[PDB]
Amino acid sequence: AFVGLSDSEEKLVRDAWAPIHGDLQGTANTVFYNYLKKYPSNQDKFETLKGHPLDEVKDTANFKLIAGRIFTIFDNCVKNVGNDKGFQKVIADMSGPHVARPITHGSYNDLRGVIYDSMHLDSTHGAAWNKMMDNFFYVFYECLDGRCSQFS
């Protein structure tokens, strides 16, 4: 279920994200590369990337746009961490494009983990981060299952 963060937890999440927020596209490019490299089945889900070597596409506009759009959503979730409705709406809106798609919970959860590992959080910040991401996935998976109206 959705579990709100305290004011102090919100501050923890903002602080946890601040290095990435400060280098959003550069972090996005690195994290997205590492994700595709570690979990190579996923590149095929991106039709603009499909059929080419990862090292050939990593420097391209198409690739950087995708990595950017993922990170922009998380950046906006963070921005909305103190507003449950606003946070839910960010996710609600990005969920539609995903509903019809052959992407497993495993694939999304593998991306969450690459992000986690890149942030190297202490346990206090990590706990607050994981409250937010647990909310993220709760909302996202509810919308993938066609129960996205409940957040409206």
State whether the Cα torsion 86-8-18-134 is positive or negative.
Answer: negative
CB of 2 within 8 A of CB of 88? yes
15, 80, 94, 125: which one binds ligand HEM (CB under 6 A) = 94
Using CB under 5 A as the binding rule, whether residue 121 contacts Cl ion is answered as yes
Q: Rounded to the nearest 5 degrees, what angle is found at the Cα of 41, between the Cα atoms of 55 and 57? A: 20
Do the annotations mark residue 69 as ligand-binding?
Answer: yes
- Site for Cl ion (CB under 5 A): which residue of 83, 104, 109, 150? 83
How many residues touch Cl ion under the rule CB under 5 A: the total is 10
| Residue 96 dihedral angles phi and psi, to the nearest 5° | -55, -55
Decide: is 69 part of the binding site for ligand HEM (CB under 6 A). Answer: yes
Contact positions toward ligand HEM, by CB under 6 A?
Answer: 42, 45-47, 66, 69-70, 73-74, 94, 97-98, 101, 103, 107-108, 111
